[PDB]
């Protein structure tokens, strides 16, 4: 019900976030994760009220893939503040 | 040589031994380094590579007979000396071809080192070429941009290759070399303004020597230590090959370096970068002719193994 519209807007508020950087790569990698939580919560919620137990595997597969996804994301982040001493995105403007 | 070979043995790790190092000996225009080199080589069986020449690449490729000057880039060290600050710039073209020649020599040396396992003495190297250009710019020989173009080629290609393990060095004050020149008489070599010889050594002394000191083992020898290959050889066998970037070269790292030197067309890929300074430019009409003519030489019109002129056979099944 409405519970779902809050979670969905949470994902859109997290969407507006990842698409509007604020000079901190880490913060973004952190917003990105806010979505995965919202997706995980929504998937788990409907699976639970549909009594669809055959699908519970998914709520977790979503997290397992999302965790590594984030692992890759942070290694890129560490790589950046090793080459530029900061995670600030402006630095990432060489490919112009 | 490829990953396949490397995967199954063929590791540079298994082919290295104490005597296996890249040792260059650098000196002024006449440091007797030619002699020291051969001996050091004779001592550890090191493959002694001769100093890089205009036609060193031609001796390297195919028949190995010396190429015509225009085929070898039209460079004269002879004209370098008799006509300094020439309108056509033969001196810069000479220097750029020389850098390409040592790039080929250094890469051929590294290929022998990682494959055979034998070490290599290369006399002067890409690492010790800049002193001639520094002196030339200090003199009216080359203009500032010319310098930038060489530096750009050096920055693009030299870092990939591993540094000389040690860099045996001779020193003989300018008066000495000039006098040494007089003994082997050659009209061209003879007319080399001292100040230019001053600038060559100055660079080694100030720039090249300390530069490599941090990177590789530095053994500087006074003329007297020289002419005594035994003693110098002894000292090399004495130094400890520790400090330097060579320490991190694991087998899986060497493989890629080997596959580079294994490909000459890449070694000097950045030597032909399309930067159009006027001396370097072939020019399309002249360049096309020189090509149609270099490519028509016997054994060159087709890849090695396929040109029948020199006596290749089995082409119809190759």
């Amino acid at each position: 019900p409405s519970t779902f519209f809050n979670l969905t807007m949470a994902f859109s508020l997290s969407l507006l976030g990842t698409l509007m950087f604020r000079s901190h790569l880490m913060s973004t990698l952190l917003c990105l994760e806010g979505m995965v939580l919202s997706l995980f919560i929504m998937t788990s919620v409907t699976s639970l009220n549909s009594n669809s137990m055959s699908s519970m595997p998914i709520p977790i597969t979503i997290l397992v893939f999302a965790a590594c996804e984030a692992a890759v994301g942070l290694a890129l982040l560490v790589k950046v503040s090793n080459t530029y001493g900061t995670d600030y995105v402006q630095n990432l403007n060489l490919l112009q | 040589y490829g990953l396949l070979a490397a995967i199954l043995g063929d590791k540079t790790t298994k082919k290295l031994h104490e005597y296996s190092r890249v040792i260059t000996v650098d000196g002024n225009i006449c440091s007797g380094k030619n002699k020291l080199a051969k001996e050091i080589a004779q001592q550890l069986g090191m493959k002694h590579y001769p100093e890089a020449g205009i036609q060193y690449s031609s001796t390297t490729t195919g028949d190995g007979r010396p190429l015509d000057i225009e085929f070898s880039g039209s460079c004269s060290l002879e004209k370098f000396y008799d006509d300094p600050k020439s309108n056509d710039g033969n001196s810069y073209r000479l220097q750029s071809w020389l850098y390409a020649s040592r790039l080929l020599q250094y890469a051929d040396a590294l290929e022998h080192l990682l494959s055979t396992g034998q070490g290599v003495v290369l006399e002067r190297s890409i690492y010790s070429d800049f002193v001639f250009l520094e002196a030339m710019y200090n003199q009216g020989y080359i203009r500032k941009q010319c310098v930038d173009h060489y530096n750009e080629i050096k920055r693009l290609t030299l870092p990939e290759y591993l540094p000389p393990h040690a860099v045996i060095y001779i020193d003989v004050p300018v008066p000495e070399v000039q006098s040494r020149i007089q003994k082997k008489g050659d009209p061209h070599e003879m007319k080399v303004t001292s100040a230019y010889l001053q600038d060559i050594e100055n660079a080694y002394k100030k720039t090249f020597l300390p530069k490599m000191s941090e990177m590789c083992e530095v053994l500087v020898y006074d003329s007297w230590e020289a002419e005594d290959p035994t003693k110098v050889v002894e000292d090399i066998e004495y130094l400890k090959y520790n400090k330097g970037p060579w320490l991190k070269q694991d087998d899986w790292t060497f493989h890629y370096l080997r596959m580079l030197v294994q490909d000459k067309t890449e070694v000097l890929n950045y030597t032909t970068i399309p930067v159009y300074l006027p001396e370097i430019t072939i020019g399309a009409h002249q360049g096309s002719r020189i090509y149609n003519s270099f490519r028509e030489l016997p054994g060159r019109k087709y890849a090695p193994g396929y040109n029948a002129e020199v006596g290749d056979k089995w082409i119809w099944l190759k």
Binding site: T8, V36 | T61, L268, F294
Partner: protein, 344 residues
């Protein structure tokens, strides 16, 4: 790369698209997309040059948010239909999300900014994979769902891409980016016919792959990322000058060569479906693409640019040969047109 790692990565970069294509449970299609994202990032930074880290960090963020949007579409569907897969009933907004998202991973139209930049900082080799074995995956997902997607949006993204790709290409002089821009354009044609005849999308792709794969292995044979660099092709390796000429004109739609067929049948299918408005404008600016293709032709073949003396040195040395694939993919591409009826 420890050859073991090379295998794991390459397997993933290859298991990535294959799981997507084979599975029907969308979820399994999403993770196929996810594995491709994870596998490509290591290779992208192989030189680890400062430009590279920038490339990967962009590619990754663009890829990641799109991946999350695709997952949201699957999560929403799960509530609007218990099924884990798009159906006739699917809410229209649910599908449009999937189009935008998938059009970001494929990099079409107003989301075409990441591709040119990542194509600029990655090696020529990984450039090919990033352009052609990473487009197969998302396109598969779209082609499967074609009956349901919107004809309007696709067309807009199609036309936009064609324009952006063309206009972008005109100014670019870096080859990697000229190709990135071409890919945006061709990708556009492909997505134009998806709603109408998916089978033609799979032709306008293969032909693009059979055209781009030879073109890039050509750019790297001499590893030239500059037109000035490819222009001295006449000295470094003269034979490839002939086919490089035809393949690039083939990439644009000129009639004798194989490249006309994809544009010709896409136009025939769109006119059959009555889009004689859309098809006309696309074909017209498609002609802009050939202008920048021919400008390169000029520099590389029809006119001989001046070269450097140091080049004579590279001639001497035996040139490492181009793999056989170049030939088989150059000819099958430059001239198969006489065999079009079977291809379609």
């Amino acid at each position: 790369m420890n050859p073991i790692t090379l295998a794991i990565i390459y397997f993933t970069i290859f298991l990535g698209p294959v799981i997507t294509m084979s599975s029907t449970n969308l979820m399994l299609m999403w993770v196929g997309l996810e594995f491709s994202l994870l596998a490509i990032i290591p290779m992208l930074i192989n030189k680890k040059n400062p430009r590279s880290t920038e490339a990967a960090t962009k590619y990754f963020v663009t890829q990641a948010t799109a991946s999350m949007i695709i997952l949201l579409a699957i999560v929403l569907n799960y509530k609007q239909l218990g099924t884990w897969m798009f159906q006739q009933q699917t809410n229209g907004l649910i599908l449009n999300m999937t189009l935008m998202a998938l059009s970001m991973k494929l990099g079409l139209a107003p989301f075409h900014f990441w591709l040119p930049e990542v194509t600029q900082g990655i090696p020529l080799h990984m450039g090919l994979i990033l352009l052609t074995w990473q487009k197969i995956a998302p396109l598969s997902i779209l082609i499967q769902i074609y009956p349901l997607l919107n004809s309007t949006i696709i067309l807009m993204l199609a036309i936009t891409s064609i324009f952006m790709g063309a206009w972008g290409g005109l100014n670019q002089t870096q080859m990697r980016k000229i190709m990135a821009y071409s890919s945006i354009a061709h990708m556009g044609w492909m997505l134009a016919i998806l709603p109408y005849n998916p089978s033609l999308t799979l032709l306008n792709l293969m032909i693009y792959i059979i055209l781009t794969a030879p073109m890039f292995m050509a750019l790297m044979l001499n590893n030239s990322m500059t037109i000035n660099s490819i222009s001295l092709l006449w000295n470094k390796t003269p034979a490839m000058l002939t086919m490089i000429s035809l393949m690039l004109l083939s990439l644009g739609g000129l009639p004798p060569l194989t490249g006309f067929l994809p544009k010709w049948i896409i136009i025939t299918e769109l006119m059959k479906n009555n889009c004689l408005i859309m098809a006309t404008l696309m074909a017209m600016m498609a002609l802009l693409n050939l202008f920048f293709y021919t400008r390169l032709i000029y520099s590389t073949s029809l006119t001989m640019f001046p070269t450097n003396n140091n080049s004579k040195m590279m001639t001497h040395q035996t040139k490492t040969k181009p793999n056989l694939m170049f030939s088989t993919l150059a000819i099958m591409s430059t001239m198969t047109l006489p065999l079009a009826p079977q291809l379609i």
